[PDB]
Amino acid sequence: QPEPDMITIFIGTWNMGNAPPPKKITSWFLSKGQGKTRDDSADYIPHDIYVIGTQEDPLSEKEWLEILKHSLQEITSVTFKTVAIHTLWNIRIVVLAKPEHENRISHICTDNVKTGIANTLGNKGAVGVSFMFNGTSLGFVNSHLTSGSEKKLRRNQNYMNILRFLALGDKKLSPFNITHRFTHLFWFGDLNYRVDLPTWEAETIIQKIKQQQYADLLSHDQLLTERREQKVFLHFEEEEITFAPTYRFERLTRDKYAYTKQKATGMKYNLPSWCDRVLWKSYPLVHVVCQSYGSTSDIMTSDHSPVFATFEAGVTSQFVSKNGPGTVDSQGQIEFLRCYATLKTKSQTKFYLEFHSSCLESFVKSQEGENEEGSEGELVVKFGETLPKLKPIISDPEYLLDQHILISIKSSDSDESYGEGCIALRLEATETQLPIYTPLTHHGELTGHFQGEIKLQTSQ
Ligand SMILES: Cc1noc(C)c1C(=O)NCCC1CCCCC1
């Protein structure tokens, strides 16, 4: 029975509005409703992994697990295995997988982050799950961010706190936050970004939604505008939105948006918005294709509609050679030529690099680079031809070309990372000098760039 080189992943996000679900929720897991929907001919084909994020979830873990498993059983005639479940307040994540994957899944981690201080600590934050699927690391974050049209900056701060403090994946990757720890990272939830148009335009917005004319609304979506201005979710992807706003509905129908200010809303307007979202970030040159992104039309117990997204994701096998794991393969090497970091920092410490990869027995520290002044004020750290030759555990090109090198640039004075990035080994050629490049981030914000050349030697 061969190991897969691709899997499909279902991502669901639903703010349940503190109400129990209706009897039937199969449309969610079938990617049926509005937007980019799944072909009917696929309805009986199970996804490999289902990741369900809820917010304002009033159910116990047991109660929701029974509903989810019975739903998937009805669709697929497969009894799915529970990988992980984790709840913070009323924010929950469930990971289910086909039984055939049980011995492919390992290193399961869960964590949560509580956002805010005092007043604003007690119901918002995030839960997450990570695991290895054969040779591929997968991370999943369900966040419920701060509500209200005039709090986009708070939502951005919630995002930065979650990616800094959520402790998932390989703890040995100490310089790296969740935005670098996984081959594929999916971040979803009630992100609570709104369509920023004047209150007086509510009926105009409703009109546009009825005509399925979303362009003038999406051009005011706060998540899209904040992402374009590099204020949040830097280096993440989102499929194009082709479904109606998923908030705020009158319950028990989808015919009416309930936007007017009420005591129950704190006298705030809730103009129709795309609160409920799925984004992802995958390592460079790894296969990831969104095959659905939409909302259900027939699940009406909440003031939000459920959102679905599905993905094809490339995965690799748990590789064994005669040599690695447990030794090097002298026939393999990774060389860096003419490398330099450009940093936005005002500081003047010396810097060194760390190279982290599961193709190495352990991480590799470089010598300090040579600081120069860049023309337009910047710090340039030159490594020249000084970088250590990296010795992978396996030399087979079928393994090595699928790997990635994480890079941290660290202060000699404090040993703190000033920037993190990632280089793919999926090169156009081996034994050939080729340009490499990554942006560098810290706490998910841009701090610099790393560029140079690579020379990869495989056993072929
Ligand atoms: C989808 C769906 N949603 O609700 C219901 C009920 C279904 C359904 O009929 N599933 C049958 C699954 C089968 C397995 C493989 C081929 C034979 C059929």
DSSP line for 395-412: --HHHHTT-EEEEEEEET
Concatenate the DSSP letters of all residues of 23-48 into one string.
S--HHHHTT-SEEE---GGGTTS--S
Distance between Cα 273 and ligand 1 center (Å): 34
Which candidate, 352, 338, 348, places its Cα nearest to that of 434?
Answer: 338
Classify the C-alpha dihedral 404-409-412-418 as positive or negative. negative
Distance separating alpha carbons of residues 316 and 136, to the nearest angstrom: 6
Residue with CA at minimum distance from ligand 1 atom 4: 75
Exposure class string for 396-405: b at 16+ Cβ within 10 A, else e: bbebbbbbbb
Instruction: Provide the residue type at 64 as one letter.
Output: W
Residue 77 Cβ < 6 Å to ligand 1: yes
Classify the C-alpha dihedral 286-289-293-299 as positive or negative. negative
Distance separating alpha carbons of residues 143 and 275, to the nearest angstrom: 11
Resolution reached, in Å? 1.4
Nearby residues of 328 by Cβ (< 8 Å), 6 or more positions away: 361, 391, 392, 393
Residue 43 Cβ < 6 Å to ligand 1: yes
- What H or E segment, with its residue span, contains residue 128? strand 125-133
Nearby residues of 218 by Cβ (< 8 Å), 6 or more positions away: 224, 241, 274
Specify the ligand 1 atom closest to the Cα of 76.
12
**Block residue for tokens 């105009």:** 204
Yes or no: say if 114 and 162 are a contact pair by the CB < 8 Å rule.
no
Q: From residue 200, how far is each of 70, 250, 352 by CA, in Å?
A: 45, 20, 55
Residue 75 Cβ < 6 Å to ligand 1: yes
Distance between Cα 418 and ligand 1 center (Å): 52
Q: The tokens of 116 are what?
A: 């805010």
Which candidate, 68, 26, 274, places its Cα nearest to that of 155?
Answer: 274
Yes or no: say if 301 and 20 are a contact pair by the CB < 8 Å rule.
yes
Which candidate, 317, 318, 313, places its Cα nearest to that of 49?
Answer: 313
Distance separating alpha carbons of residues 252 and 133, to the nearest angstrom: 39
Residue 1 Cβ < 6 Å to ligand 1: no
Cα 136 from chain centre: 14
Distance between Cα 95 and ligand 1 center (Å): 21
For residue 289, list its beta bridge partners.
312
SS3 22: coil
Yes or no: say if 209 and 218 are a contact pair by the CB < 8 Å rule.
no
Residue 102 Cβ < 6 Å to ligand 1: no
Yes or no: say if 127 and 88 are a contact pair by the CB < 8 Å rule.
yes
Concatenate the DSSP letters of all residues of 314-357 into one string.
E-------SS-SSS--TT-EEEEEEEEEEE-------EEEEEE-
Yes or no: say if 135 and 316 are a contact pair by the CB < 8 Å rule.
yes
Prior bond to 325 cis, omega within 30?
yes
Judging by beta carbons within 10 Å of its beta carbon (0-12, 13-18, 19+), is residue 160 exposed, middle or buried? middle
Long-range contacts of the stretch 370-376 (C-beta < 8 A, 24+):
374/342
Mutate to test the pocket of ligand 1, among 24, 29, 40, 44 (most ligand atoms within 8 A of CB): 44
Mutate to test the pocket of ligand 1, among 72, 75, 78, 98 (most ligand atoms within 8 A of CB): 75
| Other Cβ atoms closer than 10 A to 122 | 11
SS3 259: coil
- What H or E segment, with its residue span, contains residue 439? strand 434-442
SS3 434: strand
Classify the C-alpha dihedral 157-158-163-167 as positive or negative. positive
Specify the ligand 1 atom closest to the Cα of 30.
1
| Other Cβ atoms closer than 10 A to 255 | 9
**Cα-atom radius of gyration of the chain, to the nearest Å?**
23
Distance separating alpha carbons of residues 365 and 320, to the nearest angstrom: 26
Residue with CA at minimum distance from ligand 1 atom 6: 74
Distance separating alpha carbons of residues 213 and 207, to the nearest angstrom: 9
Residue with CA at minimum distance from ligand 1 atom 7: 75
Residue 24 Cβ < 6 Å to ligand 1: no
CA atoms within 13 A on the CB side of 282: 18
Distance separating alpha carbons of residues 403 and 42, to the nearest angstrom: 32
Specify the ligand 1 atom closest to the Cα of 26.
3
Q: List for the chain the helix, strand, coil content (%; round to 5).
A: 15, 35, 45
Residue with CA at minimum distance from ligand 1 atom 2: 75
Instruction: Provide the residue type at 99 as one letter.
Output: P
Distance separating alpha carbons of residues 309 and 296, to the nearest angstrom: 11
Q: From residue 166, how far is each of 56, 72, 209, 365, 404 by CA, in Å?
A: 20, 29, 36, 25, 22
Yes or no: say if 444 and 314 are a contact pair by the CB < 8 Å rule.
no
Nearby residues of 170 by Cβ (< 8 Å), 6 or more positions away: 107, 137, 181, 358
For residue 129, list its beta bridge partners.
110, 140
Distance between Cα 69 and ligand 1 center (Å): 14
SS3 108: strand
Q: The tokens of 407 are what?
A: 């890079």
Yes or no: say if 223 and 277 are a contact pair by the CB < 8 Å rule.
yes
Distance between Cα 297 and ligand 1 center (Å): 20
CA atoms within 13 A on the CB side of 373: 3
> What was the elucidation method?
X-ray
Residue with CA at minimum distance from ligand 1 atom 9: 75
Instruction: Provide the residue type at 387 as one letter.
Output: L
